[PDB]
């Protein structure tokens, strides 16, 4: 993250980075991450895996939004749905989205958020994804292949027509 527009590191032990005041990006958090999430005022936790976050969140008054998925099966339709839901959650307050390792599934949706929601030019989102310190390229080939393949114009058009 030497580009200032890339996500800013907050807690590397769980691969936690800030994209904005209302959007964070991480790997699987644990019980001792809760205090931090509360200081960040996270109101919603979005998971792209089947693990039940309520197990480590305990009594934290956050909404749990479970969207378990597989990077190698994500399509345009799924992305639009996720981005719409992330956006809606942001309107409620700050959002944490995570997967297992915080770099493949999360890197896919983060990258698509950059492109479709913030209008970044694809190569730029891809560079954040593969070189932002979230992991190495070998960890995220699925995310990479989807992003490389996605029709950004169509996704933007479809996003506007919702």
Give catalytic status of residue 75 as yes or no. Answer: no
Beta strand pairing status for 23-26 and 16-20? antiparallel
Separation CA 89–CA 96 (nearest Å): 10
Catalytic annotation, pick one of 11, 52, 72, 136: 72
> Per-residue DSSP letters for the chain?
--STTSPEEEEGGGTEEEEETTEEEES---GGGHHHHHHTT--EEEESSSS-THHHHTT---EEEE----GGG--HHHHHHHHHHHHHHHHHS-EEEE-SSSSSHHHHHHHHIIIIIT---THHHHHHHHHSSS--GGGGHHHHHHHHH--HHHHHHHHHT-
Give catalytic status of residue 153 as yes or no. Answer: no
Vertex 50, ends 44 and 55: CA angle to 5°? 60
Catalytic annotation, pick one of 11, 51, 75, 99: 99
- Residues designated catalytic: 72, 99
């Amino acid at each position: 993250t030497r580009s200032p527009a890339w996500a800013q590191a907050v807690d590397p032990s769980i691969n936690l980075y800030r994209m904005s005041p209302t959007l964070y990006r991480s790997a699987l958090p644990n019980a001792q991450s809760v205090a931090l999430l509360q200081r960040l005022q996270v109101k919603t936790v979005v998971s792209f895996i089947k693990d039940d976050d309520r197990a480590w969140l305990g009594q934290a008054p956050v909404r749990v939004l479970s969207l378990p998925t597989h990077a190698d099966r994500v399509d345009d339709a799924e992305v639009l749905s996720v981005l719409r839901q992330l956006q809606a959650a942001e309107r409620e307050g700050p959002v944490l989205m995570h997967c297992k390792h915080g770099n493949n599934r999360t890197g896919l949706f983060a990258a698509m958020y950059r492109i479709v929601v913030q209008g970044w030019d694809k190569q730029a989102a891809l560079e954040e994804m593969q070189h932002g310190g979230f992991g190495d390229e070998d960890d995220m080939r699925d995310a990479s292949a989807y992003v490389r393949g996605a029709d950004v114009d169509g996704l933007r058009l479809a996003m506007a027509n919702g």
